Amino acid sequence: SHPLITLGLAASAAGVVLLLVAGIVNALTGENRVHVGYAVLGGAAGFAATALGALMALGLRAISARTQDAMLGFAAGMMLAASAFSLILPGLDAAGTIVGPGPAAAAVVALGLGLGVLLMLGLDYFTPHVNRVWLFVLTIILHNLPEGMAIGVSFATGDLRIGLPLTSAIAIQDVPEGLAVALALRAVGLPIGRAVLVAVASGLMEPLGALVGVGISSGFALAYPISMGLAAGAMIFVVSHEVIPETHRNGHETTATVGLMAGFALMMFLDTALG
Template identity: 60%
Template sequence: MDFSVQSKGSWWEILRDHAKAHPLMATALLGSLLLVIALFVQSLLLLESPEQRQFMQYAAWGGLACFVGTSVGAIPALLLKAIPQKLEDAMLGFAAGMMLAASAFSLLLPGIEAGTEITGSNIAGGGLVILGMAVGVALMMGLDHFTPHEHAQIGPCGPGNERCGRAWLFVFAIALHNFPEGMAVGVGFAQGDVSIGLPLTTAIALQDIPEGLAVALTLRAVGFTPLFSVLVACATGLLEPLGALLGVGLAGGFMLAYPIGLGLAGGAMLFVVSHEVIPETHRNGHQMLATQGLMVGFALMMILDTTLG
């Protein structure tokens, strides 16, 4: 259970040297962070009405539901040391399918509709969403590049990873995965539109169940105790309510922030699916089964969006 951090050098020096070596990535991360901060601060200045506070409550409850989904999924790892790799890949494929469909039907398409309504132009409305997607992808690429973390299959990544205890590296990796999901829930409720927020929350909470189990079993597989693995998996689910509050703040202010925020959350989720979830399901020779799981998850999310939207 090594949470220690080695003391060689300083984090500032490590990040500075890494940024100098990768100036384009550093610029993209800095620019996306500045825009996110600006949108969040501007939105907070407008979140004074009882209506806006209610939207924040919706987002907080939605993020909490996702935390519960992660925790419910993780608990069986107290008894299970592992599950068949085929089953794990199918479950993660199912989660990827739900995330893909949620990005399309509950984030990007509503964002285009909102942007078109605000600007009076299909092209301008789509452009706002594309801008948000670009910011979301740049944010996730930068965080992935500059945050030390570790995946079970590919090992440690990011600057200064050798200075972190292995438990911290796994925690950071899970955080990079969970935070955009919570942010998507918050953006979905930013205008109080339950027809967007409810199916999105339901989808993410459902797909968090197999993800929570996979995370806890991964921690067990690398040598952590059952209780510690479950507690860490549950704790990382707390990032989803925090991300939800950030999301509702991002898109709850001036009108143009809403389609941009939807695009940002959609782009961040698409990055996670493409960069992490799908490759993870294709590393063990079960690509067909994982793809079938993805199709089932995508179809279920379409049904949820139609039924609850």
């Protein structure tokens, strides 16, 4: 019948629901702590940067494949580095305060990572790939939800040192993403204003994702490092499965790799400068 991916999806969605309900219940039993505010601001920055990129498509009505390969390589490189330096490693530091240090902390983050990958892997396998247009639009609007989620997760401590570099890196990555989303939507056949409209709307999952992110991470002390892994795993999958294969659209692999390494090193700079 079905692969174990279906069981992974079910257990990951159940885990997300359990984490999110634990968040709500705790938020219904605790008071006077800011940590929603920066997650909201960071998600709003994500929306605004995604809109800025999309609006550039109105004039730059198409770009060379070399530019696409460069742009999405840069986007991929930023988000792989951000998953490592701003999610996984601070998750291991956080889980090191509770059950670790040492591999007890790694088990908590690996539980996160597996849930994040199995969620996104399951969601992809339940796309059939009644039109490409509607399936692709649905895919696009949801695409930024793990980016919001990473924002809200990283800010769930209120810590500028963790959330600001990731949010800056996502915000910077959102401009290529929103532009490339808008131009892809045009190429599918939507009028450019309708394509740019949907691309702007895709940024609304970045605030909404940041609400989900601050939720799932708040219910209990280990829900934070679990959610750090979950956001990292969801991002890592989405980068490896959505973004990176679109960086080879006409074989400009050198251009794509220069973008990747530039984005990776830029994210390392952002964390070194803002952390």
